[PDB]
Coordinates of C-alpha atoms and ligand atoms in Angstrom, one line a residue:
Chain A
X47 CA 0.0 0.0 0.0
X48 CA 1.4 3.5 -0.2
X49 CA 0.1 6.4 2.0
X50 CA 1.3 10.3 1.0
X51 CA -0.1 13.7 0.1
X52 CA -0.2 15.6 -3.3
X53 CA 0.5 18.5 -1.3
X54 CA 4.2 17.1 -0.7
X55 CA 6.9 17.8 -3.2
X56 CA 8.4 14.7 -3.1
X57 CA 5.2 12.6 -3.6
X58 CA 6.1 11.3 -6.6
X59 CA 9.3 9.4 -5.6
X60 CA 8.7 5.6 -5.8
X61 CA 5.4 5.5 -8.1
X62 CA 4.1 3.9 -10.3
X63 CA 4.4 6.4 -13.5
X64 CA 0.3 5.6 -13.7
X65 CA -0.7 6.6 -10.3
X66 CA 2.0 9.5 -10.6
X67 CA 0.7 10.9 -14.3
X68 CA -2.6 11.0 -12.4
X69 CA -1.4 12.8 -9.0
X70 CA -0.2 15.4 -11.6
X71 CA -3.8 15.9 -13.4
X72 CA -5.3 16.0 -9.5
X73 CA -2.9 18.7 -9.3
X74 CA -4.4 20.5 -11.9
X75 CA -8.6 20.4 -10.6
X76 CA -10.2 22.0 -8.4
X77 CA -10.6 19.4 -6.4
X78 CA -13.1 20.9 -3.6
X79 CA -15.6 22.2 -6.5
X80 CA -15.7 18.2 -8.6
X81 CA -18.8 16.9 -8.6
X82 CA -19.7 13.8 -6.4
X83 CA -20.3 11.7 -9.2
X84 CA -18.0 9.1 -12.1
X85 CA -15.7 11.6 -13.7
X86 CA -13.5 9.7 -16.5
X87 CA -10.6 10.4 -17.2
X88 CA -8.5 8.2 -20.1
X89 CA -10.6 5.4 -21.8
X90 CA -9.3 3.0 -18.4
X91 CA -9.2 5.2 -15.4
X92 CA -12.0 6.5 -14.3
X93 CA -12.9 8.9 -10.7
X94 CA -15.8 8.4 -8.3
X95 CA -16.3 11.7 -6.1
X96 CA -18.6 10.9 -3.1
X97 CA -19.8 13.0 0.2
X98 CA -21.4 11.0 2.6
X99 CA -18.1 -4.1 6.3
X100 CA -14.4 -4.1 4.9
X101 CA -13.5 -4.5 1.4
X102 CA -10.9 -5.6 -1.3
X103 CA -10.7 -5.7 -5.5
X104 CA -9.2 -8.0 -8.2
X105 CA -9.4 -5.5 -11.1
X106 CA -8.8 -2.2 -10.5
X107 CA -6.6 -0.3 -7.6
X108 CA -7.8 2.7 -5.5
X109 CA -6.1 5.6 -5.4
X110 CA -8.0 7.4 -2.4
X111 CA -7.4 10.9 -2.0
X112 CA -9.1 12.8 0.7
X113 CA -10.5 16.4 -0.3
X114 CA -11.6 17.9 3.0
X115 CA -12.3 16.6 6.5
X116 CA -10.2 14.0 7.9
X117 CA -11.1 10.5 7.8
X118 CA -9.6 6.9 9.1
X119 CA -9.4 3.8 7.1
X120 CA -8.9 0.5 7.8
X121 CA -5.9 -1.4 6.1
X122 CA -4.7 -4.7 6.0
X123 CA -1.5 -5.2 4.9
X124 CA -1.2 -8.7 4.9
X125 CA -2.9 -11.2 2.2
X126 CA -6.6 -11.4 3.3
X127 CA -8.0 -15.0 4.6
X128 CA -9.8 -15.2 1.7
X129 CA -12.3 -18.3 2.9
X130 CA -14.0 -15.6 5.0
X131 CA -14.5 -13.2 2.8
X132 CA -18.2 -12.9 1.2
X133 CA -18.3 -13.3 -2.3
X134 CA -16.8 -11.5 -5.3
X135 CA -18.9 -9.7 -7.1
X136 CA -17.8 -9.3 -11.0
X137 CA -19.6 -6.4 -11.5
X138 CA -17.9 -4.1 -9.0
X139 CA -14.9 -5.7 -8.6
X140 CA -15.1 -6.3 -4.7
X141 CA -15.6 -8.8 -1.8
X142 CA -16.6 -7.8 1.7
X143 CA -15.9 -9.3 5.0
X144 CA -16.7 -7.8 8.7
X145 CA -12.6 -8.0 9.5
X146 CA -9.2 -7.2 8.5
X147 CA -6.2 -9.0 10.2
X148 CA -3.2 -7.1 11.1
X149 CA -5.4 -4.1 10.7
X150 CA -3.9 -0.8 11.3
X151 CA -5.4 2.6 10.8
X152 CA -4.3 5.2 8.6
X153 CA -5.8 8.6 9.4
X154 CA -6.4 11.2 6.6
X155 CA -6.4 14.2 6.2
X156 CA -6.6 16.7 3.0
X157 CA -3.9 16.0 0.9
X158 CA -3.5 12.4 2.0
X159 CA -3.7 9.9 -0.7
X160 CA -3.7 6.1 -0.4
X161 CA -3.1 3.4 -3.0
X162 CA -4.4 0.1 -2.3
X163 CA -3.9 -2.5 -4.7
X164 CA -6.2 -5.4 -5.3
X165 CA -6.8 -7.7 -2.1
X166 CA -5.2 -4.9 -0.3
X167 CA -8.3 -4.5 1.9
X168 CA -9.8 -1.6 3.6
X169 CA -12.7 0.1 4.9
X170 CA -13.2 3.7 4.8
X171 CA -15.9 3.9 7.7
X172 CA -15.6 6.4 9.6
X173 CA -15.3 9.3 12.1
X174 CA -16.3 14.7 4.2
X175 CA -15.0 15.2 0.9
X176 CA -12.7 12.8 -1.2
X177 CA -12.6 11.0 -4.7
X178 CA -11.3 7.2 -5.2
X179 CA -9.4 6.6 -8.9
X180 CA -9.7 3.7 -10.3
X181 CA -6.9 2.0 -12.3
X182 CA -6.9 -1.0 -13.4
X183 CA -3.8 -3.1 -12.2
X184 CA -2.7 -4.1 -16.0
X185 CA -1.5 -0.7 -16.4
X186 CA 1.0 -0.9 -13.8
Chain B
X270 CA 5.2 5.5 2.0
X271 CA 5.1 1.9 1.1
X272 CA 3.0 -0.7 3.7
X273 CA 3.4 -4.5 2.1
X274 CA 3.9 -7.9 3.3
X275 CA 7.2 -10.0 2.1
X276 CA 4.4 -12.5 2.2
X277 CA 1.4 -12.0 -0.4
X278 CA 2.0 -13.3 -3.5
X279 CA 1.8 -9.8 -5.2
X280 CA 3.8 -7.6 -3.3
X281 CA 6.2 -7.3 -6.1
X282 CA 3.9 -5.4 -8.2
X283 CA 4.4 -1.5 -8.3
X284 CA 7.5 -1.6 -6.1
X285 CA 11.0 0.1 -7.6
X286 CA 13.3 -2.7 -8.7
X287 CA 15.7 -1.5 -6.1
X288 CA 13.2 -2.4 -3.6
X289 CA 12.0 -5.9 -5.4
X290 CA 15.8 -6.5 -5.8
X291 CA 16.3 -6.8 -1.9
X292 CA 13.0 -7.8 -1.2
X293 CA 14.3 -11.2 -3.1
X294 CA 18.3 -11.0 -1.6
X295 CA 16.0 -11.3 1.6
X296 CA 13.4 -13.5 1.4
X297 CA 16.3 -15.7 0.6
X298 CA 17.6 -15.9 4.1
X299 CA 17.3 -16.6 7.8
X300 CA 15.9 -13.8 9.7
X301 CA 15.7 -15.3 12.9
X302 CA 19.0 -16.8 12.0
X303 CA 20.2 -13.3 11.3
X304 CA 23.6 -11.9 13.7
X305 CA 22.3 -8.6 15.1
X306 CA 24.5 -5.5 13.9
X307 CA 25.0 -3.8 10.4
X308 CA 25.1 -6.3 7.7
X309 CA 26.5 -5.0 4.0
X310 CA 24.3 -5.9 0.9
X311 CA 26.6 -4.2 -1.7
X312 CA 28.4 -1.4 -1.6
X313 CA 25.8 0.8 -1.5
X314 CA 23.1 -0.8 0.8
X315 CA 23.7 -1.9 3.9
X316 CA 21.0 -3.2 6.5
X317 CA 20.7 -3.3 10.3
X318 CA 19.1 -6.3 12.2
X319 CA 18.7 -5.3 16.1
X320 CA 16.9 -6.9 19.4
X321 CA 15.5 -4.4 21.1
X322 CA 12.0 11.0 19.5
X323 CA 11.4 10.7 15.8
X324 CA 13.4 10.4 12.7
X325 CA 13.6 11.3 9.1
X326 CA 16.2 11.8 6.5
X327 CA 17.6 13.2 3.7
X328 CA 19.7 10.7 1.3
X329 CA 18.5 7.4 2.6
X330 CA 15.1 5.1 2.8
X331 CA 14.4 2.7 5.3
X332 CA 13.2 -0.9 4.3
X333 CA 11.8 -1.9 7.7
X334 CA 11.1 -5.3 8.9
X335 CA 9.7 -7.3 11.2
X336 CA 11.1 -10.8 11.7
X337 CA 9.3 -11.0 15.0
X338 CA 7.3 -9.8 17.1
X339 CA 4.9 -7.1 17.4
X340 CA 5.7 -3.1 16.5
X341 CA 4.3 0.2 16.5
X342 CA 5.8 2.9 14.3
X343 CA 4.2 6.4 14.4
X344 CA 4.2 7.6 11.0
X345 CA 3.8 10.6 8.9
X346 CA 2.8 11.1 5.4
X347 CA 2.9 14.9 5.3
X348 CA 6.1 16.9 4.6
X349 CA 7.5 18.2 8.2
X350 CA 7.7 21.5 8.4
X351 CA 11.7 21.7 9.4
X352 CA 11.9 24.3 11.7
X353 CA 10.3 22.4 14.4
X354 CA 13.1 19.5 13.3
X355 CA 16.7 18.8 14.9
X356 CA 19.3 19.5 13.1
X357 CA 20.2 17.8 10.3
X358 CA 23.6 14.9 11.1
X359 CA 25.3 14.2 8.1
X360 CA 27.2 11.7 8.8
X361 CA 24.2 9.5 10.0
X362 CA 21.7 11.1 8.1
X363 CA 18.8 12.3 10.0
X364 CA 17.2 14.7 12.0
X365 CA 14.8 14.5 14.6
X366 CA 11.7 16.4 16.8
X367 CA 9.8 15.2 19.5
X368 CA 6.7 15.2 17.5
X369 CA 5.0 14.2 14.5
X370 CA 2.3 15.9 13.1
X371 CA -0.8 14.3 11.4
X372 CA 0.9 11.2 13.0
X373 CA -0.5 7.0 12.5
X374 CA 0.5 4.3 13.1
X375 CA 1.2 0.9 11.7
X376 CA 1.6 -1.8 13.7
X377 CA 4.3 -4.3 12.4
X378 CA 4.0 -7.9 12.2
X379 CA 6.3 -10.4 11.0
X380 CA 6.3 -10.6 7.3
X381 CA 5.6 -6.8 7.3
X382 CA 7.6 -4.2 5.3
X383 CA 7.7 -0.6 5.3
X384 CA 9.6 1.9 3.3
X385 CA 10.2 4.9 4.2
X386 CA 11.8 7.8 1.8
X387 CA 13.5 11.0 3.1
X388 CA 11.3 13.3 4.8
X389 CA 8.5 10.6 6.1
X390 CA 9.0 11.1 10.2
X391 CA 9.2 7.8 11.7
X392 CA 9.3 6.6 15.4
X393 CA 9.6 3.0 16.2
X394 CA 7.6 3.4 19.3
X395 CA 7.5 -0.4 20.2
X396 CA 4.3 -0.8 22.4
X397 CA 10.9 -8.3 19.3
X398 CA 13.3 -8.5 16.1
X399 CA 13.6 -6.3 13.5
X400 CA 16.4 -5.3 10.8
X401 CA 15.9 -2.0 8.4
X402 CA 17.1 -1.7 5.3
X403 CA 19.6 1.5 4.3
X404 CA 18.7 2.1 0.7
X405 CA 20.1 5.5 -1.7
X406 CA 17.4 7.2 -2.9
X407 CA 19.7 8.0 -5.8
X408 CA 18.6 4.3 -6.5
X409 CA 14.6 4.4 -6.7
Ligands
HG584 HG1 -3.0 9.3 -8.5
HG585 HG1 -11.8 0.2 -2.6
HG586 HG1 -13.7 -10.1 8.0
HG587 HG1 10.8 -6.9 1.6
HG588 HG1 14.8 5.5 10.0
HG589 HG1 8.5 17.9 15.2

């Protein structure tokens, strides 16, 4: 997983030239005034802007960025048990399941952005704006 | 930041050769087996093993691991504003404070790796075996 904020110079180092093209087009919105709602992006990645059980994909990754308020997630970091884990639904690319092993939590706050690849699990839950990127792990 | 496990089939995937290189030179080894003290890799990395404020830096990244155990590291994704910091020591590259702000923190388990480039403030808090891994940054 990898936890940093587009607000620090440096973010870049280490990425994925996917994840980082895209931290530089974030860079370029207006983040607070995006519409909750899908905005795409290429013909692959696509952007899901939201204001308001733990979950993990096969498909796609999730680039979470957090736009204003501060929020905690829930991160595994170790391979999910995957014989307890409801079942995957192709449509979403997802599975659920009430608990995360080795769970730590990352706190967020604007700026913040958090990669978690497939079977990475997590749970946004709780304690808001933010946006969640979707690319697709071939292109990595 | 990078939060993996040397233990899920995928971790490879999105990490920086340099990373993947040792990732392998370790996982072919005997952690528990390991002598505590600085161990060489090459002639530019170098690891420590050990049995036991915070820290960042300027040149180096830290490949953290935990052979055994259980660990806390308080950990911070945004960019430290360096006044508050120490004072920077060359010769063992880092600097310290007393705080971190917009602090987490993960909690290590064994399996568990963390990377940690220049600038992310760290504190091995330790609510055990561990080694980190001295990597140039020249080399991601
Ligand atoms: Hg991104
Ligand atoms: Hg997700
Ligand atoms: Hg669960
Ligand atoms: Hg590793
Ligand atoms: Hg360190
Ligand atoms: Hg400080």
């Amino acid at each position: 997983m990898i936890i940093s904020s587009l607000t620090n110079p440096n973010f870049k180092v280490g990425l994925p030239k996917v994840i980082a093209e895209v931290c530089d087009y974030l860079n370029t919105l207006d983040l607070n005034a995006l519409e909750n709602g899908r905005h795409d992006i290429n013909d692959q990645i696509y952007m899901n802007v939201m204001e308001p059980k733990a979950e993990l994909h096969h498909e796609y990754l999730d680039v979470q960025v957090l736009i204003r308020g501060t929020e905690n997630i829930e991160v595994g970091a170790t391979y999910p048990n995957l014989s307890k884990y409801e079942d995957y639904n192709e449509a979403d690319d997802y599975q659920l399941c009430a608990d995360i092993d080795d769970k730590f939590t990352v706190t967020m706050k604007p700026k913040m952005f958090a990669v978690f690849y497939p079977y990475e699990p997590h749970k946004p839950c709780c304690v808001i704006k933010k946006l969640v990127v979707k690319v697709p792990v071939k292109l990595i």
